[PDB]
Design a protein around this ligand. Structure first.
Ligand code: B12
Ligand code: B12
Ligand SMILES: [Ca+2]
Ligand SMILES: [Ca+2]
Lengths: 180, 551, 138, 552, 139, 179
């Protein structure tokens, strides 16, 4: 069942060496796999592993104020001890954000969820950790498929409409405990 | 067992596309939805008290903005009373001047004009579009990007694009920090292809305005607006912030248009149970209300939404028509992939291509689609020959022309060398001769040597953070053996001082001559009137490769 | 006296009507002057005069809303780039308190004489309260 | 050093197409040629003394035929004096009724009407076409053939075609002696798909009339006419022989139309230095003059000619518009291959598809193109899904509909079994149960077992030489367990007795109900008027394969 | 003869009784039963000159004069046997006949079939075939 | 010049023969068909196929028309067996028979670009067998949906050129085949 447990309102990091992974309001709940069937449990596992293999701590939170991946990520970079966060929607869309950047700007973006693999997710974790250590890592190789929208846009819209139902205005993020 | 006839059909590319049955409650309906608001308007003491059935007490920011600035209230009640069918008839009637229609449309409410165009079939819509189009002469816009954000490739591809006929070219980024490099590369290459071509770099709003302030772009197009408040909000703006942004660009002498497109509200989760066309009509009115001169619409990036439902492609044509009918420049999409089928994407393109719009395509990909950073365009570099053939077949000016391989190679090479001189002169990571050569004969990034991305973005960012403006680019060119390109760059920069190309549908052709809806008025009055393909332009289109003299 | 469509394009029919923020002419901008810094980016900025001539032309062409936009732009030519970005961002969702917006309006008006823009911003302030787009409303 | 960008373009299919520069001297120019005659007409004592600059003393058989029977002389001088631009304006003006135009267009000389439509762009032409189209409801015609002239396959494919929506279906032959079999198989299969679908078998003229007299066809279309006298001569006819042939068909109660098409005169060696459109205009007037109700045109079989030159596809639409403007039913081609490119063939099709014509295509291939005996159609069996999708995308009635595999399998199977009973009843080389199954699930002849062709054509010719008529087919069906199909066959034959479907644009729908331009008048008057896709027909078009409920 | 207007169309729906066959059969006489027993044969299933002339009147009322003309000609040809139809058609094809053979055909059509319109049509062709050289021996 | 006129072609002097009638430019102004196959080779194969069947081949050139059907008809009316083969310079071929309408035939090959030297030999065989009153399996049908898109314009041009050699009222000339 649920591999994510709420441990209370997410608050400002107590140490600098951490990266916050902010997930959408339906992640691991009403939705458990991304747009191409990859389990959320596996995705989180890989992102965390990527961050930790870089000697950085991973801290997961859930955002409710918006289902937009940029704002989910901003919610997190605002509390991250390193200023760095990774936003992830249930459908899979991911972004590496940094406190101080405009909400719709970012460090790295993955605009085509259908193309991401568990390997990409791990690499996203590693790069985020490296940004946390103030390094300048080679950005994750750009993936682009002209038929991605033709084949998945409608499904993406539907999946988003569904996660958006879980948006709760004014509700601050909740830190989550990840079960093995 | 199975019918082999059906197994053959099951393998067809079109069957890989996404289709869905209408779902009104979530906005999954292109147009003509029974749940859309009945048109209406009530005015008291000069102020709107009701807009399309909604009382002013329930107005959201979009309603307020439209009610206060997007409708000519002096005749709104008069026009509201007019028969919609008759109005639709007037739109396609070749004998009802454009000048007679604009005063009526600009007095209609969003629901009113939607009810009007919804009475029309696509042929009538195209018949009306050729008349309502603001600029007499149709144009074209292209995408120039690649998956590596390789500046050398962008320069070469941009030069080729300009040479083929595009009057506007747009780039964007895989890695946001690369922006400055992409813009400069696009600008230089474009001016080498044809001085006067306008360039843009689509990014997050504040980032793009800043980049424009530094002088590394000629205009901005993706200045987004949305049809519902929740979506607009997730878009990080309001009608007022975007209205302010519009004037900010003008205050810097930069041309700009807004961007919208049917299906965005659905894609972003809040269609508030309205049809795609109705919501897009609100976007068109926000654009008008803001005083913005043009709009890029026709679903654009969310084309996979309307295309999935019935009459979605027709609705796309309809929103383009509403735009032009409201006396707004219209960059009519045809810039995003939605189907695996060549037949289907062609039928979608012809809706705007046949009648002609200010920009038939607001993003024809001048690079193979695998390199298209807007996730693929409705047309790409490999379709250039087909495009020129159809222009020839139908005697239709599609804004492009056939070209000689020798001329393109030479133009791409010069653009690459010019950019090489810019980088050397500005102390940017070097562009090697091997790279110049690769960009010259390349088809896409697959033919380009890998660059040090970390290095490039480091310097790209110093351009923004250290405020290195466009004059440094001019200087680099002028002192690196490209006095001519430097002069052209300076001339394009000087265009931001006059304010002439800030007008409706303005582009810059020939020798620094501005061509807009103001000095190139569309005077359509039926057959043999208005813009007509002919003369040297017709001869240029007729001369396609492979057409041998039967002796 | 005031520009009409017949005066368009200005660049062709009345190049002399066009002056820059530093009172430079189109001809002053040559490669020579750029290379020796006789003219700099500071010199290359459209004036409120030019924008108002275009606003008049737009109006004569039947596009009133476009003219208004140019009128606002004319006022904004006096506002520094960094301040333009500041005010734009302040108008975006959940960025400001009503007080800060009104503060921006007053500044626009008293420091830049941008009454149109100031009124535009005050209008936003009132509606942002009603539609809850001020800081803390999300 | 080659540009990889151009090496990519060089491999594009469109570059395999044939293109040529205009060659006026030999008629290799689609339209608007400086060689074409200036419009004119002089009338003395109610007879034409001059036609488009040519004195009656120099008239060829075509000038004579058109001058004496093809022009409405009462108003010829009046319309000749009218400005051609204003005339072209009237054609596309939604508020100038078709009924007000016809009297004037039929009074124009061939050069005059060509001058008129030449002032129009494709959009204006389409705008005018939707108004000038004779029948209010648009329709569709398909090709049903195969490289083996396999009768079982024809019957099955004909049933599927009829089921998908075609109201007219046409076959032809690889080996001429096979004709009787192809025709009968076409007719039987068509009536099984939808009773009322009209069928034809395109052959040499005398051969086709004879096959019609025997009652194995419902109508004839490829009754050719040509733009120049020498070409008409090699076509083995004159305006008078074709005129006589037209009335012969009607005298037997059979519907018929003529066929022409831009480029035929160039293809046949004598264009007499005139543009394709001008020569096609003469063909359209020959058709009018003969008193024939409709015409199949739009380059048709010679599409490779106009498409090779500038404004060729535009000329094709123009000739279609001239046809309808002259108040003639128009079967608008879109039935022949001219390109290797899907983008290009789609643009050519939409010219008629968007506005709608009496028959959007006069030969959509209901079989995969390798089996198309007309050397390939602009669309074929593999395009059925794309066609339905575009109908849905643009809310345009293209005459076809989505269908279920199970229904098609059942209909194809019944058609094959019905033919099996016909062959058994008429004592023809047997159709085995294996062939019935093959035809049921086949895509093309590659899935059909080989037949004894020598034996088939032997009996096929005995049908002609012994005058075995259509009633033998009815009896075979009636006595072979197919009383229903037999009755439908007899009903289609009875239609030849009333003369009702002989009228302009006539087809038969529903329960043997004729639908022509007489009782289904086009009344276009701009938006929200005239034929509009809606109701059940719209619902039917929306329901395409893969359209899944998003709600879930 | 009896005229008809567009309102009388389609005859099958408005006036099915007006339709008879060359052997004076009615539409109702044509049933599977009668076909199988040969009570009715191909000979009975032939449109009549009366029917074609009624359609001609209708074509005329619909504003289609030439189409009516065609139906009038067809009305006369109903009386000519199939084989004779094919012979006359082929005689009109290029280089098939002498002027006299055509004139003879015209006289036959007129005196034996009362096909005066077709007779005039053929005599017209004869004259023009001489002028445009389409008679036998002209190739 | 592998074709020499030997006088006006006349009615056959024996039943067992098939006439091959060629266009007015065949082997003259034009020497190869639409896809480059030499007229000399084509005529060689057609003749070989005919002779293989124990039938004589007689070649004639037609001038009254360039249309392959009428070229073939001029042949069937002179052929001792009533059977003829018509061939245009561009390669289009047809097996005709005296008595059939001009535009009808026994076998037709409407797509010249698809014919190979083997097909031409097979055409000669079938013609001979028809001459022997036999009923041969028709030559397998060749059909390519892209034949027209690729070759129709060229076909028109080649035919326009051969058509310039048409001579009204000039009877066929029998021809002697070289080598
Ligand atoms: C469709 C599209 C849009 C649509 C839909 C976005 C949505 N939120 O629903 C619209 C028009 C609204 C849009 C807007 C913007 N976009 Co956009 N968009 C695209 C496009 C062409 C295709 C993506 C796609 O269909 N993927 C396939 C589906 C199946 O996968 P998906 O994972 O579900 O896709 C989602 C993400 O791509 C996401 N998304 C789209 N744009 C952006 C931008 C940011 C910053 C983020 C975090 C997410 C995001 O929306 C998709 C649907 O939910 C991409 C081009 C590309 N290379 O992918 C650009 C692209 C990703 N967008 C871009 C930008 C800059 C923007 C804007 C900031 C522009 C503006 N004027 O403000 C806004 C951001 C809006 C927001 N709050 O999210 C850039 C990103 C540059 C970068 N490296 O950071 C790209 C690469 C190119 C471009 N300029 O269009 N976009
Ligand atoms: C284009 C075409 C036409 C055009 C061009 C013919 C020309 N003489 O220039 C037009 C419309 C005029 C035409 C007419 C007729 N055609 Co035609 N035509 C075709 C088609 C669709 C394509 C051929 C092609 O483009 N090949 C590619 C080019 C590159 O090769 P090619 O060798 O140069 O092609 C030439 C021959 O095909 C020839 N040709 C065309 N039709 C005929 C018919 C006969 C009897 C002969 C001898 C030659 C011939 O003309 C072509 C151009 O020169 C074929 C279908 C098919 N399966 O091939 C039918 C086809 C060959 N035609 C057919 C028929 C019956 C006719 C007509 C008799 C019909 C009529 N109403 O009278 C007339 C004959 C005209 C004449 N004097 O030759 C039948 C033949 C049946 C048979 N087995 O005998 C076919 C198979 C199907 C059909 N019904 O359309 N045709
Ligand atoms: Ca664009
Ligand atoms: Ca046909």
């Amino acid at each position: 069942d649920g591999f994510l447990t709420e441990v209370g309102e997410a608050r400002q990091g107590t140490q600098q060496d951490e990266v916050i992974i902010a997930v959408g309001p339906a992640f691991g709940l009403a939705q458990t796999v991304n747009i191409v069937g990859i389990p959320h449990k596996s995705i989180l596992r890989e992102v965390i592993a990527g961050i930790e293999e870089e000697g950085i701590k991973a801290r997961v939170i859930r955002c409710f104020k918006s289902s937009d991946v940029a704002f989910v990520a901003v919610e997190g970079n605002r509390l991250s001890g390193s200023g760095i966060s990774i936003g992830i929607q249930s459908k899979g869309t991911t972004v590496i954000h940094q406190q101080g950047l405009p909400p719709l700007s970012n460090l790295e973006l993955f605009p085509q969820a259908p193309l991401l693999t568990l390997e990409t997710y791990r690499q996203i974790g590693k790069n985020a950790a490296r940004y946390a250590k103030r390094e300048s890592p080679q950005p994750v190789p750009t993936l682009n498929d002209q038929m991605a929208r033709p084949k998945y846009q409608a499904k993406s819209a539907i999946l988003h409409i569904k996660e958006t139902k879980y948006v709760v205005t004014g509700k601050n993020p909740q830190e989550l405990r990840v079960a093995l | 067992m199975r019918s082999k006839r059906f197994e053959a059909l099951a393998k067809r590319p079109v069957n890989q596309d996404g289709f869905v049955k209408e779902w009104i409650e979530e906005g999954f309906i292109a147009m003509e939805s029974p749940n859309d608001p009945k048109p209406s308007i009530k005015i008291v003491n000069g102020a709107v008290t009701e807009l399309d059935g909604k009382p002013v007490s329930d107005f959201d920011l979009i309603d307020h903005f439209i009610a206060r600035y997007g409708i000519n209230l002096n005749r709104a009640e008069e026009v509201m009373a007019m028969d919609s069918v008759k109005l639709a008839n007037m739109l396609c009637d070749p004998n009802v001047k454009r000048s007679e229609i604009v005063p009526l449309t600009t007095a209609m409410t969003p629901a009113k004009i939607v009810e009007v165009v919804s009475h029309m079939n696509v042929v009538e819509m195209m018949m009306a579009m050729q008349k309502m189009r603001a600029r007499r002469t149709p144009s074209q816009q292209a995408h120039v990007t690649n998956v590596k954000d390789n500046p050398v490739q962008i320069a070469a591809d941009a030069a080729e694009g300009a040479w083929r006929g595009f009057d506007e070219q747009e780039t964007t980024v895989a890695v946001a920090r690369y922006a400055p490099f992409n813009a400069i590369a696009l600008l230089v290459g474009s001016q080498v292809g044809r001085p006067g071509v306008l360039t843009q770099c689509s990014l997050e709003e504040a980032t793009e305005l800043k980049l424009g302030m530094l002088g590394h772009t000629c205009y901005a197009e993706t200045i987004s607006v949305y049809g519902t408040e929740p979506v607009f909000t997730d878009g990080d703006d309001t009608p007022w912030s975007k209205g302010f942004l519009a004037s900010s660009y003008a205050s810097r002498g930069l041309k700009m248009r807004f961007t919208s497109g049917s299906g965005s509200e659905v894609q972003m989760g809040y269609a508030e149970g309205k049809s795609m066309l109705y919501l897009e009509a609100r976007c068109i009115y926000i654009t008008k209300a803001a005083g913005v001169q043009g709009l890029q619409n026709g679903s654009v990036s969310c084309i996979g939404v309307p295309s999935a439902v019935p009459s979605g492609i027709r609705a796309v044509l309809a929103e383009n028509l509403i735009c032009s009918s409201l006396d707004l420049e219209c960059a009519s999409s045809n810039d995003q992939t939605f189907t695996h089928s060549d037949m289907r994407r062609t039928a979608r393109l012809l809706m705007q291509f046949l009648p002609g719009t200010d920009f038939i395509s607001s993003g024809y990909s001048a690079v193979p689609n695998y390199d298209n950073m807007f996730a693929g365009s409705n047309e790409d570099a490999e379709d250039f020959d087909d495009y020129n053939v159809i222009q020839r077949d139908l005697k239709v000016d599609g804004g492009l022309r056939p070209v000689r391989e020798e001329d393109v190679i030479a133009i791409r090479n010069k653009a690459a060398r010019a950019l090489q001189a810019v980088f050397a002169g500005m102390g940017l990571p070097p562009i090697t001769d091997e790279e110049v050569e690769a960009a010259t004969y390349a088809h896409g990034s697959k033919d380009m040597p890998e660059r040090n991305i970390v290095e490039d973005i480091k310097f790209a960012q110093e351009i923004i953070n250290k405020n290195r403006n466009g004059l440094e680019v001019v200087k680099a060119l002028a002192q690196g053996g490209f006095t001519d390109v430097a002069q052209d760059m300076l001339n394009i920069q000087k265009a931001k001082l006059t304010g002439d190309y800030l007008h409706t549908s303005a582009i810059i052709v020939g020798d620094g001559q501005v061509l807009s809806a103001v000095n190139d008025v569309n005077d359509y009055a039926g057959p043999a009137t208005g813009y007509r393909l002919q003369g040297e332009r017709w001869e240029e289109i007729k001369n396609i490769p492979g057409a041998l003299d039967p002796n | 006296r005031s520009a009409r469509v017949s005066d368009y394009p200005l660049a062709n029919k009345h190049p002399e009507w066009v002056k820059t923020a530093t009172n430079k002419t189109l001809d002053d901008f040559t490669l020579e002057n750029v290379l020796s810094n006789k003219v700099t980016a500071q010199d290359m900025r459209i004036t409120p005069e030019t924008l108002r001539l275009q606003a008049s032309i737009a109006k004569d062409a039947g596009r009133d809303r476009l003219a208004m936009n140019f009128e606002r732009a004319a006022e904004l030519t006096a506002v520094p780039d960094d301040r333009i970005l500041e005010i734009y961002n302040a108008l975006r969702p959940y960025r400001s308190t009503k007080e800060e917006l009104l503060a921006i309006a007053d500044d626009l008006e008293s420091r830049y004489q941008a009454k149109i823009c100031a009124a535009f911003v005050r209008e936003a302030a009132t509606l942002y309260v009603e539609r809850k787009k001020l800081k803390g409303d999300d």
